[PDB]
Design a protein around this ligand. Structure first.
Ligand SMILES: COc1ccc([C@H]2COc3cc(Cn4cnc5cc(C#CC(C)(C)N)cnc54)ccc3O2)cn1
Length: 282
C-alpha cells in the first residue's frame, strides 16, 4: 500500500511557504472559537506567479499558550508535507515571522457541508466520492484525521467537496456534539472511544457516519443521548438505520465502515472504486 519514509509532526517548518502579511487585507471573519479563528482575505501576488486572489487565514485569538500556539504550528507543519490535492483544503502559504502565525488556505466559497445540506432540506454521490478521494490521499501519507464529519467538509466553486479541519477556529467547547471525557463521540470508532486508539481504519468508521450525514444533515443516532446506555449499544454492534435518500448499495458501504473489527472495514482505496462503479450506473 503506502510506506511512510518520514512523519511531518516531527519535521520543522519549510520556509518556502512563507508569504509577507503586508500583501493581505482581512475581510469578514468566517468562523471562530475561544482560542483561535478563520477570516477571508486577499493575498496580492501568491504562488510562483504574480496573481492576486481570495483565501482564508487561520490564526490564534488573544487567549493562546504553548498548548494551542504549538498545535497551530503542528497543523502548519503537517500541512506543508501533504502538498496539493483537488479534494482537500490545501495550504497556499504561511506567515511565521514578524507576528503571530497566519496560515493561508484555499477559500471554499460555499462553506461547510452540514450547513449546505440543512440549507437545502447524483450530487450526493459526487460529494461522497470527492470526500473519499481526499481521505484516500491523507491515507496514502499515513496521516490520521481524527475529526472526519460533515461539519469539517468544505464546498469550493462548482460544489467540489474538500476535507478540512477547522481545529482552533471551531467552538468545540460550546458544541454539544463534543463530549468532555477527561471528543466527538457520535463519530468515533469504538477502538478510538474505549481504548484511545486512532487509525485510518477509525477514520473509515467516521467516514461511515459522514455518509449517513444522505440523511440530508441529521444529527447522528437521532434522539439518542450519549451516556452509559449509548456506549453499550455501539459495543454490542448497534448500527443506525438506512437514511431516506440512501441507495441500498451506499448503506452497504456504511455497514461495511461500521464493522467492529478495524481490519474487516474497507480502505479509502476500496470505497473510491466501489463509488466509481456506482457512478456511471447513475
Ligand atoms: C488533515 O488535513 C487537513 C487539511 C486542511 C486543514 C485545514 C486547513 O485550514 C482550513 C481552513 C478552512 C477555512 N476555510 C476555507 N474556506 C472557508 C470558507 C468558510 C466559509 C463560508 C461561507 C460559505 C461564506 N458561509 C469558512 N472557512 C473556510 C477550512 C478547513 C481547513 O482545514 C486541516 N487538516
Amino acid at each position: 500500500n503506502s510506506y511512510t519514509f518520514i512523519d511531518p509532526t516531527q519535521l520543522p517548518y519549510n520556509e518556502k511557504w512563507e508569504f509577507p502579511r503586508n500583501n493581505l487585507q482581512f475581510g469578514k471573519t468566517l468562523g471562530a472559537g475561544a482560542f483561535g479563528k478563520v477570516v477571508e482575505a486577499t493575498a496580492f501576488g501568491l504562488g510562483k506567479e504574480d496573481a492576486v486572489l481570495k483565501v482564508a487565514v487561520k490564526m490564534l485569538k488573544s487567549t493562546a499558550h504553548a498548548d494551542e500556539k504549538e498545535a497551530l504550528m503542528s497543523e502548519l507543519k503537517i500541512m506543508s508535507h501533504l502538498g496539493q490535492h483537488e479534494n482537500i483544503v490545501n495550504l497556499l502559504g504561511a506567515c511565521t515571522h514578524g507576528g503571530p502565525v497566519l496560515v493561508i488556505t484555499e477559500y471554499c466559497c460555499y462553506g461547510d457541508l452540514l450547513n449546505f445540506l440543512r440549507r437545502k432540506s447524483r450530487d450526493l454521490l459526487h460529494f461522497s466520492s470527492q470526500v473519499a478521494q481526499g481521505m484516500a490521499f491523507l491515507a496514502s501519507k499515513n496521516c490520521i484525521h481524527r475529526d472526519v464529519a460533515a461539519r469539517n467538509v468544505l464546498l469550493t466553486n462548482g460544489h467540489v467537496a474538500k476535507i478540512g479541519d477547522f481545529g482552533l477556529a471551531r467552538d468545540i467547547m460550546n458544541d454539544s456534539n463534543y463530549i468532555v471525557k477527561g471528543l466527538p463521540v457520535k463519530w468515533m470508532a469504538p477502538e478510538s472511544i474505549f481504548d484511545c486508539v486512532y487509525t485510518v481504519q477509525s477514520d473509515v468508521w467516521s467516514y461511515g457516519i459522514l455518509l449517513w450525514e444522505f440523511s440530508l444533515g441529521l444529527n447522528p443516532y437521532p434522539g439518542i443521548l450519549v451516556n452509559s446506555k449509548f456506549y453499550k449499544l455501539v459495543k454490542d454492534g448497534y448500527q443506525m438505520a438506512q437514511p431516506a435518500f440512501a441507495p441500498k448499495n451506499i448503506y452497504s458501504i456504511m455497514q461495511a465502515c461500521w464493522a467492529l473489527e478495524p481490519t474487516h472495514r474497507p480502505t479509502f482505496q476500496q470505497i473510491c472504486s466501489f463509488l466509481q462503479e456506482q457512478a456511471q450506473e447513475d
